[PDB]
Write a protein that binds this DNA or RNA. Structure first.
Length: 667
RNA sequence: AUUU
């Protein structure tokens, strides 16, 4: 009933690239964007379901976003600033998602930036050579400052004194400077011996600093307290970030080894007293280092804390209980592949370019983002996935290095791996009946080099057969076989279609892959073939076959006549049954609606997905939410109006045809 | 230090 977005992962090793304002709104830098998430009653979630929603994106930087900071000035919580490896500092208005103004004053990679808690239009940024800019965005003024010739890691403007800024460097140096006196160093805080977070005591000073040296140091405007991180059982090097809660100044929250969060008790100074977050609940803690911690006080006054992590989860912590309220997962690579299980309805496998398979339990009642990760034996970009049609938990996958594997997602065992590799990327995986020389279902894998292998899913480490030998023998072929780029079995298991590099599609019949038809329609490499399902209103529809190539135009063919005549010599088809025009770039994926007769969705490099009434050649609905090139699409199993798509923007969107404003792709 |  509402959209969802699995977004790109929060950027790593950035001291402040996420922030939140009251009510409220969380933003996080991810790749070249900032993603915005409404949190609390304003998200409008059912009681029990986590009160967050992904609501927007700040689009316009051309390289990695390294910094993000909201304004914390009442009445302008809608303003925020970003830094980027594109060299710019931008001021944005999240109401319109547009740039207010920006500068390109830095000449070296920007490290971070901070919006002044005291001056309404002042943003202070710092770079890898040590240069600092003060930017008063709303009066067109700026000032460069240069304190020490060292790489800035972090910077925090005082909450109390408008001229005072603390800066932390790569080498462990910390300084408090006065920006009204050309950045004069007012205090040099000597103590740390490796990379510097800086949090000021929220009552009027003390500063706390967190370091790669595994210490938190609390200083006076001289050191007053050194806290070494504890070594705890597990359940990269350290990143040590801090949140000093403004309403509980005797508490200090830190990250720790492995992404554990601690609440330190500053009253019990000496004894290094802390309380571990999530200490009761099992497996809700982060599993890798935490980079940023952002407090968010909701309008119903719940105190929350958002964490970002190298584990690719964003977690929301309830400060009253220190338990995890909810988790938003994210993706660290292209979304190459989507596959829904026929056995466990709603179980959605996603093949991602960060080397981890995701299985999204899409129908989870109380969680819109119930995602589990599978990393064992994967280790490269997962470019193809296909669930077994009847065996629960059985997930085939393929990779950009030619590897084919079989997961049991109901176990914790590493997957079985095929001993035979493809030379190139595994494009497609499909189950179907075995064919000679193999002896219920075989696994078929098509690689970019053009071979389709038949694997025995019980003996994966055994022999896998190039099906071209059977095709050659059964059809008495003398010349070299086409370079196969796609495989798709008809739903009855009786006909295999191969799509080829030269654009042709070939139709083969069991048992021996006798060729019965060649379709010559596409003039470029075939990327996707899909056969219509068998549960529509007329049996004729199971003969419909949609296909897409590196050209924009989609075809449907109707293979009833040829299949039913079982010819002794093959037929050539050169006219389409239906033609679907509208896209403006290559077609990566086509899928038929299981809820309708003759309804198709297509994904394109044009950045859109299109829903078609294929039988009337009528475009119905065009989705434009992705920023990237779409690679995969799949209809939701229970909602006729809901479709999932994945793209090279590192996003998976779940979207509703009823909420989309266009009927056809951009011209 | 991942972001094709």
């Amino acid at each position: 009933q509402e959209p969802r977005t699995l977004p790109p992962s929060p950027n790593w090793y950035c001291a402040r690239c996420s922030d939140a304002v009251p009510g409220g709104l969380f933003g996080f830098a991810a790749r070249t964007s900032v993603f915005l998430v409404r949190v609390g009653p304003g998200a409008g979630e059912s009681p029990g379901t986590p009160p967050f929603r992904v609501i927007g994106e700040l689009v316009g930087h051309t390289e990695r976003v390294s910094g993000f900071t909201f304004s914390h000035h009442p009445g302008q919580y809608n303003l925020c600033a970003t830094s980027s490896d594109d060299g710019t500092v931008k001021i944005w208005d999240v109401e319109t998602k547009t740039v207010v103004t920006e500068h390109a004053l830095h000449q070296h990679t920007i490290s971070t930036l901070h919006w002044s808690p005291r001056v309404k239009d002042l943003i202070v940024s710092g770079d890898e050579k040590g240069v600092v800019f003060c930017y008063w965005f709303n009066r067109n003024d700026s000032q460069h400052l240069f304190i020490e010739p060292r790489t800035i890691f972090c910077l925090t403007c005082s909450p109390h004194h408008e001229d005072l800024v603390a800066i932390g460097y790569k080498d462990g140096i910390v300084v408090i400077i006065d920006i009204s006196k050309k950045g004069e160093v007012i205090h040099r805080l000597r103590g740390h011996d490796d990379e510097i977070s800086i949090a000021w005591c929220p009552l009027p000073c003390y500063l706390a600093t967190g370091s790669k040296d595994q210490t938190i140091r609390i200083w006076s405007c001289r050191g007053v307290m050194i806290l070494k991180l504890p070594f705890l059982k597990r359940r990269e090097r350290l990143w040590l970030t801090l949140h000093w809660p403004s309403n509980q100044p005797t508490q200090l929250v830190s990250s720790c080894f492995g992404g554990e969060l601690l609440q330190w008790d500053l009253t019990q100074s000496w004894r290094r007293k802390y309380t571990l977050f999530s200490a009761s609940s099992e497996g809700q803690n982060h599993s890798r280092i935490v980079f940023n911690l952002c407090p968010l006080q909701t309008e119903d006054d719940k105190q929350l804390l958002l964490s970002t992590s190298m584990d690719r989860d964003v977690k929301c912590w309830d400060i009253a209980t220190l338990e995890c309220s909810w988790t938003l997962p994210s993706l660290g690579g292209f979304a190459y592949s989507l596959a829904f299980s026929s056995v466990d309805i709603g179980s959605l496998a996603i093949g991602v370019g960060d080397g981890m398979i995701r299985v999204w339990n899409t129908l989870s009642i109380k969680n819109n983002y119930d995602v589990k990760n599978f990393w064992q034996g994967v280790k490269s970009k997962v470019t193809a996935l296909c669930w077994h049609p009847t065996k629960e938990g059985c997930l085939a996958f393929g990779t950009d290095d030619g590897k084919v594997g079989l997961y049991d997602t109901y176990s914790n065992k590493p997957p079985q791996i095929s001993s035979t590799y493809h030379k190139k990327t595994v494009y497609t995986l499909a189950w179907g009946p075995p064919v000679p020389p193999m002896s219920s279902l075989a696994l078929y894998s098509c690689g970019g080099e053009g071979i389709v292998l038949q694997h025995n899913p019980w003996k994966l480490s055994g022999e896998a057969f190039d099906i071209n030998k059977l095709i050659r023998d059964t059809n008495s072929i003398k010349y070299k076989l086409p370079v196969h780029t796609e495989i798709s079995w008809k739903a009855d298991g009786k006909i295999m279609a191969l799509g080829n590099e030269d654009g042709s599609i070939e139709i083969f019949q069991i048992p021996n892959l006798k060729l019965i038809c060649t379709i010559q329609q596409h003039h470029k490499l075939v990327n996707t073939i899909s056969w219509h399902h068998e549960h529509g209103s007329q049996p004729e529809l199971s003969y419909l076959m949609a296909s897409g190539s590196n050209n924009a135009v989609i075809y449907v063919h109707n293979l009833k006549t040829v299949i039913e005549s079982s010819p002794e010599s093959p037929v050539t088809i050169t006219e389409p049954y239906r033609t679907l025009s509208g896209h403006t770039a290559k077609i990566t994926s086509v899928a038929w609606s299981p809820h309708h007769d003759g309804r198709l969705v297509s994904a394109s490099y044009d950045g859109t997905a299109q829903v078609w009434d294929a039988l009337r050649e009528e475009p119905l609905c065009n989705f434009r939410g992705h920023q990237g090139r779409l690679l995969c699409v799949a209809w939701s199993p229970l909602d006729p109006d809901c479709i999932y798509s994945g793209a090279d923007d590192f996003c998976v969107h779940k979207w509703l045809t009823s909420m989309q404003d266009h009927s056809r792709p951009p011209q």
